[PDB]
Design a protein around this nucleic acid. Structure first.
Ligand SMILES: Cc1cn([C@H]2CC[C@@H](COP(=O)(O)OP(=O)(O)OP(=O)(O)O)O2)c(=O)[nH]c1=O
Ligand SMILES: [Mg+2]
Ligand code: NA
Length: 319
DNA sequence: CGGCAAATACTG
DNA sequence: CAGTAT
DNA sequence: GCCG
């Protein structure tokens, strides 16, 4: 478990996403075994664990150490360091490494940075910190108030880890919509200008403001007063007809979403933040070829029901 | 062999 | 489009 | 990596 995690992270930072999820699944299994793995045959009996993983287990439980962990490239720690810069992923980290960069100082002084990456670097430490749930509330209220200021009808909901009831939040995810099914259009320009006027927003990461069909705003904010840190803010404005699917998507968790969408896929359906669809056509590779039909989903419960699944409260989706 | 814990939104 | 993000 |  504690040993299988080091490998999982290494593969993740190296770009082997599926192997990484493979390890993550095994680790999760071991963390829920009525008893500690005492034998190879026992390890193989657990779903999500096979000979390969079992062997490594039978080694850690015996040899006390896993030879694998002692052979992990020395580049990993650096790749992880670089990958934690907002806007930089595995490809950029590997490129910087190949170019001989080994520290953030190297990046600051020698690396070519995108506009997003420079913001990520400037707030490096802050972006790795999680904020108290209470601060998330304060941030949501700052956005809601600015929104209801020019349209008291607007509906604002804090989603993500906040809605799932977590004690701390990585960022604050605010969903904005309007019950009148029309007053949501082009409200990003007004809201962002307002939030900027009060100095709440400090940096923009993703915001297609030239597009009137802008769907999301990814940025950075900071509440007033001393002792405040820069916090990440994710805002999406959606049409009321998509409210249920958008809320479901934005609430997550990410793992929960992928599992739910995977289920829908096994039923010839498809689920996005826009809608739940049926009669979806896919090829042998599993890729979509036909769009299908959009199903009516007034509430999140409707989505679960149409999928033949028992409704799950947000805190029940913390996967 | 090859899909799996998906499906979609910006950036340049 | 490739890369990164939710 | 797992598994059909
Ligand atoms: C990353 C990701 C996220 N989602 C959904 C479901 C979650 C919300 C918000 O994402 P966030 O990373 O803030 O997650 P959050 O749960 O809020 O956790 P933090 O507290 O912010 O870290 O978006 C998704 O469908 N696919 C993804 O790959
Ligand atoms: Mg969040
Ligand atoms: Na990153």
């Amino acid at each position: 478990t504690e040993k299988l995690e080091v490998l999982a992270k290494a593969y993740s930072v190296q770009g082997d996403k599926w192997r990484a999820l493979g390890y993550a699944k095994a680790i999760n299994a071991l963390k829920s075994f009525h008893k500690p793995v005492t034998s190879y045959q026992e390890a193989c009996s657990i779903p999500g664990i096979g000979k390969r993983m079992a062997e490594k287990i039978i080694e850690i439980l015996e040899s006390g150490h896993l030879r694998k962990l002692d052979h992990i490239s020395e580049s990993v720690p650096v790749l992880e360091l670089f990958s934690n810069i907002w806007g930089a992923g595995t490809k950029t980290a590997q490129m910087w490494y190949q170019q001989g960069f080994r520290s953030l100082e190297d990046i600051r002084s020698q690396a070519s940075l995108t506009t997003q990456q420079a913001i990520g670097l400037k707030h490096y430490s802050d972006f790795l910190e999680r904020m108290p749930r209470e601060e998330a509330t304060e941030i949501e209220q700052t956005v809601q108030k600015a929104a209801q200021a020019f349209n008291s009808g607007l509906l604002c909901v804090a989603c993500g880890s906040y809605r799932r009831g977590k004690a701390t939040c990585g960022d604050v995810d605010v969903l904005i919509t309007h019950p009148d099914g029309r007053s949501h259009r082009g409200i990003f320009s007004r809201l962002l200008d307002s939030l900027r006027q009060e100095g709440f927003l400090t940096d923009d990461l993703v915001s297609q403001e030239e597009n009137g069909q802008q769907q999301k705003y990814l940025g950075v904010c900071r509440l007033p007063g001393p002792g405040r840190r820069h916090r990440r803010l994710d805002i999406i404005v959606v049409p009321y007809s998509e409210f249920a699917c958008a809320l479901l998507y934005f609430t997550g968790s990410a793992h929960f979403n992928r599992s739910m969408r995977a289920l829908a896929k096994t039923k010839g359906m498809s689920l996005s933040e826009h809608a739940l669809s049926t009669a979806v056509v896919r090829n042998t590779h599993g890729a979509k070829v036909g769009p299908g039909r959009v199903l009516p989903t007034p509430t999140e419960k409707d989505v679960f029901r149409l999928l033949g699944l028992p409704y799950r409260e947000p805190a029940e989706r913390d996967w």
